[PDB]
């Protein structure tokens, strides 16, 4: 804290409490007894534990029929309107599209759709699977999952 | 009628003015006016001016016939105080409070 180490007043004779510095934490305008510092909150998770949780999550999605497997999922042109129509007739509004190969055409179509996400099998995280109401996996996307999950 | 009238930020202290206020509380305006006229206090002329204003407000903005008016309510409230530094002996300093007050007078014909 900006200031000086000079004692505000003498140790004795003054009728007030003993003070040592203007920057003491019990003083106005300067203090904070335990000041925070920039810290890393990331924690270690074992590889097997990460895989086990991912396997556990996928199984339960299948059990709650929240996971739908279909053939290749693609859009002819990079238009959000087309993607909205394709998801409308399927009665899906909050979906996570997982495809084996990432194509810019599908990536751009879903960019402006908040409730819709497009992802690759490699870039799969537990939070996304849990958060999204429905998960749609392509045939290719499914295959890569077992290979990486093993 | 209400026909209130107040004077805010009077320099006189609330305690000192409050002695004069108690004299005329509940009395008719005619008796209140000459009571203040012959009261030897600074607060007397402050309160009298407020009472004159209240009577004028009733006469102009409200019904006439100010003869039958009475001071139904009168109270003095402490106002903002000005802090001043007054040197004392041995290089000591002390705070002088210039106390103000709000004088409120309410007159009615009933």
């Amino acid at each position: 804290v900006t200031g000086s180490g000079k004692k505000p007043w003498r140790q004795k004779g003054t009728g007030r409490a003993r003070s040592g510095s203007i920057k003491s934490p019990i003083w106005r305008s300067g203090g904070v007894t335990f000041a925070a510092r920039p810290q890393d909150h990331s924690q270690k998770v074992n590889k097997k534990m990460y895989r086990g949780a991912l396997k556990s999550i996928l199984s339960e999605l299948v059990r709650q029929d929240r996971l739908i497997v279909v053939e290749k999922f693609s859009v002819e042109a990079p238009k959000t309107k087309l993607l909205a129509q394709k998801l409308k007739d399927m009665a899906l509004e909050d979906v996570l599209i997982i495809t084996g190969e990432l194509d810019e055409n599908l990536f751009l179509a879903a960019r402006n759709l908040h409730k819709v996400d497009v992802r690759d099998a490699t870039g799969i995280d537990p939070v996304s699977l849990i958060a999204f109401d429905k998960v749609v996996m392509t045939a290719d996307a499914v295959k890569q999952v077992e290979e990486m999950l093993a | 009628m209400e026909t209130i009238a107040k004077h805010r930020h009077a320099r006189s202290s609330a305690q000192k003015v409050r002695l004069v206020a108690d004299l005329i509380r509940g009395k008719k305006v005619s008796q209140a006016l000459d009571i203040l006229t012959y009261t030897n206090k600074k607060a007397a002329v402050l309160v009298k001016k407020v009472l004159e204003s209240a009577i004028a407000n009733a006469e102009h903005n409200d019904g006439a016939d100010i003869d039958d008016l009475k001071v139904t309510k009168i109270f003095v409230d402490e106002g903002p105080s000005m802090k001043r530094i007054m040197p004392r002996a041995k290089g000591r300093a002390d705070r002088i409070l210039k106390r103000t007050s709000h004088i409120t007078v309410v007159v009615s014909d009933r």
């Binding site: 505000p8 007043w9 003054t14 | 041995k90 290089g91 000591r92 300093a93």
Partner: peptide, 17 residues
Amino acid sequence: NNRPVYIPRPRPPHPRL
């Protein structure tokens, strides 16, 4: 509002009962 006091005081005859 601090007003530091720089007033030393005289040393009286200590109790020394």
